[PDB]
Amino acid sequence: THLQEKNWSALLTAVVIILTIAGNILVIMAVSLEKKLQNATNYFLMSLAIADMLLGFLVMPVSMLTILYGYRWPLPSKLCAVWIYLDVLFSTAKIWHLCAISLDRYVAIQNPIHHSRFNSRTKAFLKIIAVWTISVGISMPIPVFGLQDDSKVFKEGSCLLADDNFVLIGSFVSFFIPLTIMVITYFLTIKSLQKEAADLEDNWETLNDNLKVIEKADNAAQVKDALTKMRAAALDAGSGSGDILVGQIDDALKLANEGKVKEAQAAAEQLKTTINAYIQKYGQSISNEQKACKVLGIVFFLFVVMWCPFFITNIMAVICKESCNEDVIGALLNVFVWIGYLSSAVNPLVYTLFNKTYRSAFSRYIQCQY
Ligand SMILES: CC(C)CCC[C@@H](C)[C@H]1CC[C@H]2[C@@H]3CC=C4C[C@@H](O)CC[C@]4(C)[C@H]3CC[C@]12C
Ligand SMILES: CN(C)CCOC1=Cc2ccccc2Sc2ccc(Cl)cc21
Ligand SMILES: [Zn+2]
């Protein structure tokens, strides 16, 4: 029965490993091939996928091997610190990539021309490298104090974080703080997007009012005034996209400057439909931003929820070092770490479920259609 349980646990963990590897390889392929997904957010998501693939290649199979050997470290003792370091490094890179995505998208939408078509690809790669560097800096104390002292990474022959200060500082620096920052940034982001939609409605109101004023105008001065208001409104409502709409308003304005009232009014009549179409397009862009915000919130929520039992049990075990049952806590950790690895695997499934570009790319990759 003991062998039965360890063999089925190892098999389930192997299923989790293969799902992780396949899904994250597919995500890497989709981001590197599909030209629609060439923004900074998808670059960060591919970095996340690479981190998950490294976690499934370097950490999860060694964890399965540890399971097979009754949780006694089979490899040399110096490799336990390296294993814990790689695990912590990849998980910290994941969580801080999510936090960086949140902050970056928020600060981005805080920019009046952030619907422009000029987004720098190189800067995203630089930010990703900086996040990897700060993750390495966060994780380095674990090898530092683990290669010197074997007691902080070993507990009765098993390989796991044993230092209480290590567990506390790690749980705060790599889990709690980014979680709080992400929650706050998420709510601030929904507020900014609401403000964006409100301003868009305001610009549409201005465009409609002045269109009617143009429809019933006597002289060129009235037409020019209404067109000036319209131009400012349309420029603000483009939010940086760079449209023909302001140029067409400038054409009408030029007509009005020449004292040609009837022709300016005809130009405005033409402008009505163009204005409606472009306003609808701008609101669609805002809605797309909202949908991306919700999808990334789903991803962050899944990661946090699926890792929370492990961190809760770890903090609890550090609090009641001898008051609580350590065997049951050991089993709880041995299950919750794999729950967190399942979180590491789940993300490509979400990308498929809620992103049509990813879904079509994956459907074509499964059938080897490149
Ligand atoms: C193309 C873009 C989006 C993805 C780039 C991924 C790069 C920057 C990431 C993915 C895997 C990362 C590596 C993962 C493991 C290690 C070993 C560690 O001891 C030092 C950091 C180092 C070497 C990381 C450096 C940064 C790294 C190479
Ligand atoms: C050997 N393996 C099990 C270590 C993995 O534990 C951790 C995972 C993580 C998961 C998700 C985000 C961040 C981490 S950073 C971390 C920090 C402190 C401790 Cl105590 C654990 C810990
Ligand atoms: Zn926007």
UniProtKB/Swiss-Prot annotation:
Subcellular location as annotated: Cell membrane; Cell projection, Dendrite; Cell projection, Axon; Cytoplasmic vesicle
Keywords: Behavior, Cell membrane, Cell projection, Cytoplasmic vesicle, Disulfide bond, G-protein coupled receptor, Glycoprotein, Host cell receptor for virus entry, Host-virus interaction, Membrane, Phosphoprotein, Receptor, Synapse, Transducer, Transmembrane, Transmembrane helix
Binding site for serotonin: 87, 314
Species annotation: Homo sapiens (Human)
GO cellular component entries: axon; caveola; cell body fiber; cytoplasmic vesicle; dendrite; dendritic shaft; G protein-coupled serotonin receptor complex; glutamatergic synapse
Outcome recorded upon mutating residue 87 to A: Abolished binding to serotonin and psilocybin
Activity regulation note: G-protein coupled receptor activity is regulated by lipids: oleamide increases HTR2A-mediated activity. Inhibited by IHCH-7179 small molecule: IHCH-7179 acts both as an agonist activator for HTR1A and as an antagonist inhibitor for HTR2A.
Protein name in UniProt: 5-hydroxytryptamine receptor 2A
Extracellular topological domain: 70-78, 148-164, 320-327
Domain comment quoted from the record: The PDZ domain-binding motif is involved in the interaction with PATJ, CASK, APBA1, DLG1 and DLG4.
